[model samples]
Target: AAQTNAPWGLARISSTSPGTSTYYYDESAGQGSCVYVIDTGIEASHPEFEGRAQMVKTYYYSSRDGNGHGTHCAGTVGSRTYGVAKKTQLFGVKVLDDNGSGQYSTIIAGMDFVASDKNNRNCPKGVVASLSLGGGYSSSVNSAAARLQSSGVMVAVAAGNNNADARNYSPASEPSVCTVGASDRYDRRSSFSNYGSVLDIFGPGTDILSTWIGGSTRSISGTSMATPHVAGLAAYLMTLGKTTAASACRYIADTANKGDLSNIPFGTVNLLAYNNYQA
Candidate 1:
């Protein structure tokens, strides 16, 4: 479950400045956590998710049906009325479409788009990428992840749903990416979660209630769910730091609660706020 403190409500865009300001950060004052979601893509115009598009430049990778996976993940990270960080900016990338599948090359292309955003110039300052799907690790992808990391982009990859000890493939295995595992509100490792040393942190991924296609909401599972909680937390942390990848991540880990999830591996959890709470 997301913490009760999760932000709610829309950032009204009546005037240019407020609209721009709200778009930049209404709940946190344009202090939004910019993120890239490489999944099925989002419905984008839902009322709850209005005016929050930092627009990291979108791209359609496949003709598949993201089968509600991408939209569901977006809801977790940037739900307007229901998400924990509803005020954040989301960059929608359609790596997988209605078919629930896509090519690794397309996934790499999305990462490239995110990495090469310097040309766009309008890209969000403290950007984070939310990736929910994974199959096998790739050296080429690892190279891309390293490149993105070097550019100050923080990536949260899903630990596979294999329910085995093996690490999730691709970006999650890459040294620069952050691998996340599924956990329940009680802070326990989900039986379905893939666990090992590769796990960075745990988040609410089990039966999570989030947005769906056609402007509705639903509850789903997988390490994908866990990735966004951390993604939302990362957005808030960016507001407190230099807005660089390392600083944002350091601030997050430095501040997290070091949660107790029985038998689940944990390098950290609930960052920025956790550190501030102690202070």
Candidate 2:
């Protein structure tokens, strides 16, 4: 169980990062942690789940991942083989339609739902929200994410797939959200990843292999794929007793593998590789 199941991302956290004692990958596989995935929907019947993922329909669409994006992200966040926190409990909250469309109000509503159930009896370890969707800036979405973070629920968002400044994006530009960008296994920023001061860190998003909608696995790329990596790590951190959103962000930022990214305008941002914590 200590071995990393996927390539590039979890491997770096398990073996390469510094202070390598506290981050016990097997022990911290989010046994007591939980994550709320706010996306299209999740294929709850996927085999990789082994009957662990929880589904909650929060939008017009039912909890069935027709677009495949949500299930892929959910797998990376907590499936047995592709996930960062392999034992972490996953909760799906559908906010987008089958065609991957949704309004800011629905997104905010999904956030509000997860926020309301942060300490749901089923998830005693705590909860964090993973958002892989974004658009232009919206004060409402920003405010919702901020409120969730302020209420002690960690929120991770994609920094957009367009090769532009992430400051132009919605939840990514939000102050309280842990904005994430895409990087490759070689520690280089993905060509399509958005950057700028808003990006908090880079994660393995290129050719990422994860659970798909049809109970299978596939490789995909984008900052959307990268966001769940951070979210899973946040869940793992929570299992270690770092319960607050601020502390999760701090541990992720402070203990990340630093100065490893290239081919990006943003210089020297901490890359999202884990390190052992002292306390």
Candidate 3:
């Protein structure tokens, strides 16, 4: 349970139970970090972003969000009220089109761009690349994730919405990627979320509310929603001087809450609870 005013996902990550308004960890943690959201796009002008959300040029389209999913995902990563990394710089890389579908080649190209331009953008704390979209396995994308991680860039990926083994997916199945799955308020796996050995962590993703395309807020569901929560945590850790992506992922797993998910299948991974650990 959380305070009536707090976002449920934020409350869960911060370990804020009913009547608790403040987080156990510093909510002001990701000030110097940056997050790159690879999705449909983002409505950078949304009030939740406060003008910090930037649009990077992509291969397939412009940076403006039309589908609203990308904007929602971006909000969960850095919105002032609805996010985990409240002060991290948010950047959008549009890989998916208006219909929310994109080729793996396009996604790989976006990854290349982020890796190439990360330091040039003045992000001394490093960048967290968040991907909330996936289909079947893509060796190219998996290789990209590994390459990015080797370069000290943290990559967070969704475990897919197919309620099956996440190992069948591309980037989610990649061991180097911090793959996230959807969990409900009770810490139970979402019925629509994929599970298995590939899942690295879990996050609040059921009916999550965040920024939308029209500068409004909306509720959406899926592992897509869960991915950004972990991504935000990764960014927050980076700001605290955690230089390598492996170190950040280690912190996330080591400090996550076991809670009640231990009995569920593929619930072996710790559930994300950021406030349980500190810089």
Candidate 4:
């Protein structure tokens, strides 16, 4: 099977390519940099991420490592040996259990922990949290996330995978969070990507090849993959002195592919401009 079905596949599937890397030129694990990942806690034993990935706080809203979805997602962004942003620290805040699902409140609580955990050593400066999980929408979440954003926490979220009205989720639907949509190796919207105006930016999310526990790798597709690419890139951008989710989102949007990808039956996602950000 082909690793990438879109027009940008050449740049997306290779470990040496920009898709698996954080930012265009900023390669290498940023030893002092950090990004908060509010997802399933990492396997912690995966060779590629063993000594590098760190779990700050965990909230088991569901199960842990049944299917390894979170593990895969984590590896995509922070696999010490196989990731794009290997130098940056990943703070795991597990909200989804093994079932790959969780209550909305549980996710909210995880964000709260990321926002309020100041005394903890794991607390990150220039923090960027990647949330690839989402289900529904609630008006109440807007003000809450806005409060957190005001507190200096930058978030990058998956636009959602179910292909609903697309504007119909809680955190991803929120305007404050950088709502990430999925694009294949060719930079086209994945078949499952939710669309509409809520979409903020896109990254390598479809047919993504990444590190898994126990020295293995495989290709899976989803906005889940795309969200972290942006999250890690946001951290890399921050390391380069590009702060704020708004700036990060704008950079991504400004640089991504605004064209057609054969595999994608939907909209375009920008994947090139971050490295060439003009303004």
Candidate 5:
């Protein structure tokens, strides 16, 4: 505990390839940007947040997290220890419950809350919305995400973990969302990751060690874990002047390491997310 242990995912994004131990990131830590974590809620008091995390909305009595999924995702997005955007302003938008499950209506309501928030509208650097949970194809969820992006938020969604085409999922298939796939430490596609042309980029997701509830940490695997890495990267890009959805998306695509991922799925793009930071 005397020193920092950067996750492979973090170091991987900061560099083009693996075999790196240090995470080289810009000093901003996504300063001036906002990231809304729409999931099972967040444990804002987690020490990784360094008192910067806040719960803006929740279906539960409090924004405090019961399920560890949202807290882990939040940590990846902006926690001081495991976050890609270490200084981002975190807002917990809970849709899922203690069991990490939620109705379509609850999900929509959560997105609507973030989309309508005044802080998002006037975000100095930019606004990013991270949706790590989703189900099969649905018109309503797709529309809600589209509207959220239209409100000037850069939306990053999970490509699902079904090991099938991402086109079968809702927000992942939704063209307006920046869908992210998962990669392992070996710089290859995760065995269970969904892929397709719908995937915008791949991120380190397999066995991602990040912040969990109860002031501790945990290593988890999923497209859920990968989505926040891209969201945090998008927020970090916003700090570099790629502030809008299109701009941030394009820059992310451009800076990412092309043809770096092995075992990439058939129809998916070969871009692996990178921060272009040299250590």
Candidate 6:
């Protein structure tokens, strides 16, 4: 038995092909870690946050989540009800607008904000950033993301939903970021998820239920949904002193499940994110 109910995405990572319905996370998992949700923004008042999620940084107008994507992504990363790391501190970075779009400069500024955040430099446990948005190749955005990762932050980016080679994307294609692809409960590659060698891991992204706008929950899909699973695990690993980007990525990769998924495309990494938590 497990202490708390596990979402399919959470449960799938702890076991092999046939995962369970029970989540197995420690009470102190990611107790002092920091996660930056670089997307729309977060509904900081959501009960799912238990007063942990906060909308602190934004290059745009408000620090609130208008598109719901940030809230959902933040929920998967560390919400009390729907997250992987229940105790991690969540910082919502509003980069995209309510229309789910942004200029390259806007996106780059958000990344720079993260890198410039003083707390991120010396958070107690560690720091991890979840980027669920991406676009075509852009060296500026890619370099900024790499700079954040290089600054000792574990960065997990979506492999994109283009259903094509992920190598064509910006931050996802960057070498320093941990590019994540989407997988279903059945361990099949998500039909819409982009693939290719840029991906470092896979996570459950299809029909994922998590915190939405107005203190509600919603089910959504995308490589966007797949990314936080890896980011949350990266935060969990942070609690174990895997603070550096390289260490967190290596730890997650080394512990990830291999050869269990199907319908995988060429060049995509076969590893599925796992927490290695036992009960």
In terms of lDDT, which candidate is strongest?
5
What's each prediction's clash count? 14, 0, 0, 18, 0, 0
Worst 10 residues of 6 by lDDT: 118-127
Candidate 1 lDDT: 0.62
lDDT (tens digit, per residue) of candidate 3 on 130-233:
99988888788899878877777889989999888888888888898788988877666788988887787888888888989887998889999999999988
- By descending TM-score, how would the candidates be arranged? 6, 5, 3, 2, 4, 1
**Candidate 1 off by > 4 Å:** 1-32, 54-66, 118-124, 166-168, 265-279
In candidate 5, stretches whose alpha carbon ends up further than 4 angstroms from where it belongs are 1-4, 118-122
lDDT tens digits, residue span 1-279, model 1: 123323211111111111121222324522545777778877777666786743344445442324778777877777754454566777777776477776778777888888776445444557888889887768887777777777778887787787765344767777567777776555567778877666666566777777887778777788888787667667655655535666555555554445445655443232212213211
| All candidates: CA RMSD (Å) | 7.5, 3.2, 2.6, 5.1, 2.1, 1.6
lDDT of 2 by residue, 1-279 (tens): 455234556565554542222223645678877788999888888988888787865677367788899999999898887888888888899999989889999998988888887756376666788999999988888999998888778899999998988888889899778998888777678899998888887787888888888778899999988899899988887777755566777678877777767786845365665635432
lDDT, candidate 2, at 71: 94
Question: lDDT value for candidate 5?
Answer: 0.87
For every model shown, what is its TM-score relative to the native structure?
Answer: 0.79, 0.91, 0.92, 0.81, 0.95, 0.96
Per-model CA lDDT versus the true structure? 0.62, 0.80, 0.80, 0.64, 0.87, 0.86
Regarding TM-score, does 3 or 4 come out ahead?
A: 3
Residue 152's lDDT within candidate 5 is 82
- Cand. 5 TM to true fold: 0.95
Model 2: number of backbone collisions: 0
Please say which candidate is ahead in TM-score: 2 or 4.
2
